[PDB]
Every structure is written in C-alpha cells, then in structure tokens.
Amino acid sequence: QSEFCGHDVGECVPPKLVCRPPTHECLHFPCPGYLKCCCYP
Structure with missing residues (x-):
C-alpha cells in the first residue's frame, strides 16, 4: 500500500557511489x- 525508505525497506547512499547490488532507485x-535511496529486493 505504502512504504518508506529507511533500512529494511531501503537504504540511503550518496550519488558518487552507485548501488552495487541490483537495487531499484527509489x-x-x-x-x-x-x-539517493535504493529499494531492496
């Protein structure tokens, strides 16, 4: 329904560093x- 970028749902990282794992930029x-925050699988 709804989600928030925190830890389990997602992580926050700088632009200079790209998401190593196959995470969805959200x-x-x-x-x-x-x-930039990434969305875990």
Whole structure:
C-alpha cells in the first residue's frame, strides 16, 4: 500500500557511489543533500 525508505525497506547512499547490488532507485524518505535511496529486493 505504502512504504518508506529507511533500512529494511531501503537504504540511503550518496550519488558518487552507485548501488552495487541490483537495487531499484527509489526515493521515499527525504534524505540530506542530493542523496539517493535504493529499494531492496
């Protein structure tokens, strides 16, 4: 129904570092600066 980017649902990482694992670039939680959140499988 709804989800939020935190830990289990997802993680927050910088743009300079690309998501190693096959994660889906998703943004749900307002992270600091131009950060990017990834969605776990």
